[PDB]
Amino acid sequence: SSGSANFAGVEYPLLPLDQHTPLLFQWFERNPSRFGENQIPIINTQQNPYLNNIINAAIIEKERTIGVLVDGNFSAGQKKALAKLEKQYENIKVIYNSDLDYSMYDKKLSDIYLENIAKIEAQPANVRDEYLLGEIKKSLNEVLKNNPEESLVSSHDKRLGHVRFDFYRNLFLLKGSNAFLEAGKHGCHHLQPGGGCIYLDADMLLTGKLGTLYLPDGIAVHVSRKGNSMSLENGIIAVNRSEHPALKKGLEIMHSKPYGDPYIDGVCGGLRHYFNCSIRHNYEEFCNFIEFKHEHIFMDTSSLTI
């Protein structure tokens, strides 16, 4: 009707993401004091021109809502500089991660561990992952001794680096367009409840308008190529609707797997399970099928050398 894509002998209609689908960037800052007290607390060096890349995307995509999901202990002057950025660029909306409610996606760690202890103990002795069982029982024991109410959100809230960025990235994309409405962003043009979202890594340069994308069941992700290898990546995630069943599958894996990774399980696991890229299927074929491709998305050049 408007396109079709094939993977593992199943046809998937290309669903449109209209030119109003918001863009999303993420900046979670551990050390905001490294920036001036009156500076936008986003990295903007010639090695990492992230603030420039966000602005350049907002300049190109005039009609489209541009989200910047931020977190960290920003000074009063750094929040005013972020407030001023939303004024210089009408389509830029700064969303503080602390202003969103993720409790509907949460689960208690004690519930996950008990489920898995019961699942593993039902198995016969000749198939039981005896190392994993001991580790889970150990993880449960530390929860009951230190923080018996610890959940996926509270535990991920304490982690450092990418694992906490990746965790909230998945949950924001499950909210989709609703997240801008929940955060009380005014003047979001054509932004609909139940609407999708397009996450972009800040090291990527938009050089032209995306227009309308056509993606298999309304989802696609970045596929990175390094040397002669390719890999599913979370550097780009495009969904045409809130609560996309492939990301919902990724969350269900987080709710059942004892040490679920937001990237490996929440995105790669969710996608693979959803489209039946089983272990007996061609990973390379799935990458070509699910890959987000657009002529106006440019890979970071600053990385490169001889």
Catalytic annotation, residues: 233
Give the dihedral sign, CA 123/126/132/133. positive
Give the dihedral sign, CA 139/141/143/148. positive
Residue keyed to tokens 């599958």: 249
Residues 6+ apart with CB under 8 A from 202: 25, 26, 27, 42, 50, 53, 54
Tokens in use for 240?
């045409």
DSSP H or E segment with residue 119: helix 109-122
CA distances from residue 103 to 98, 109, 211, 274 in whole angstroms, order as listed: 12, 14, 34, 24
Contact 101, 134 (CB under 8 A): no
CA distances from residue 13 to 8, 119, 238, 283 in whole angstroms, order as listed: 14, 37, 15, 21
Task: Pick the closest to residue 187 from 10, 64, 51, 75 (CA basis).
Answer: 64
**What distance in Å separates the CA atoms of residue 287 and residue 244, rounded to the nearest whole number?**
19
**What distance in Å separates the CA atoms of residue 266 and residue 47, rounded to the nearest whole number?**
30
In a 3-state reduction of DSSP, which class is residue 271? helix
DSSP H or E segment with residue 180: helix 178-182
**What distance in Å separates the CA atoms of residue 99 and residue 182, rounded to the nearest whole number?**
8
Residue keyed to tokens 């535990």: 155
